[PDB]
Amino acid sequence: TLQYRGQFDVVRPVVRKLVSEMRQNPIDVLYRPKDGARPDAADVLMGM
Amino acid sequence: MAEVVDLATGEKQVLNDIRGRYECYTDVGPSFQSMKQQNRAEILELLGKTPQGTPEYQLLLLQYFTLLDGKGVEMMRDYANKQLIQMG
Incomplete structure (x- = not known):
């Protein structure tokens, strides 16, 4: 388009x-x- | 020995157990993942609100006792136990 389009862009x-x-x-x-x-019992498991 | 009490049951065939059931009323409280979780915290609660007196130390050991697997936890939990039994 031909009119200007700009970015106040607050959300980020x-x-x-x-x-x-x-x-x-x-x-x-x-x-x-x-x-x-x-x-x-877990250590084994978690271990991996 | 010639005395004993507090044993569990099988209740063989499917679907059986005395009709003297409801012995537990229902209250509410913080949600816990499991039982060991609750017992752990329930002791911490008991600490702080108690002086550095004797009963304190037991709680403490009790605490290490309740801890779940690890290089660290195992050794200390193991000491904690040893201590506690020897505490009698």
């Missing part, structure tokens, strides 16, 4: 924010044993 900054937050709060898995399982 909040996007980048959130990401920047989730990036430094990794959060992985855990695999606890179980109510009846012997203590060292």
Whole structure:
């Protein structure tokens, strides 16, 4: 088109924010044993 | 020995158990992943609210006892146990 089209573009900054937050709060898995399982049941698993 | 109590049951064939059931009323509380999870935290709660007195130390050992597998946890959990039994 022929008329000017520009970018105040407010939203990214909040996007980048959130990401920047989730990036430094990794959060992985855990695999606890179980109510009846012997203590060292997961380590194997998690180990890999 | 000539005395005992507190044994579990099979209840052989499918679908059986006494009709003297409901012995558990229903309350609510923070959701836990499993039992060992709850017991763990339930002890932490008990710590802090207790002085550095004796009963404290047991809780403590109890805590290590409850910890789940690891190079670290195993050895200490193992000490914690040894200690606790020897505590009698």
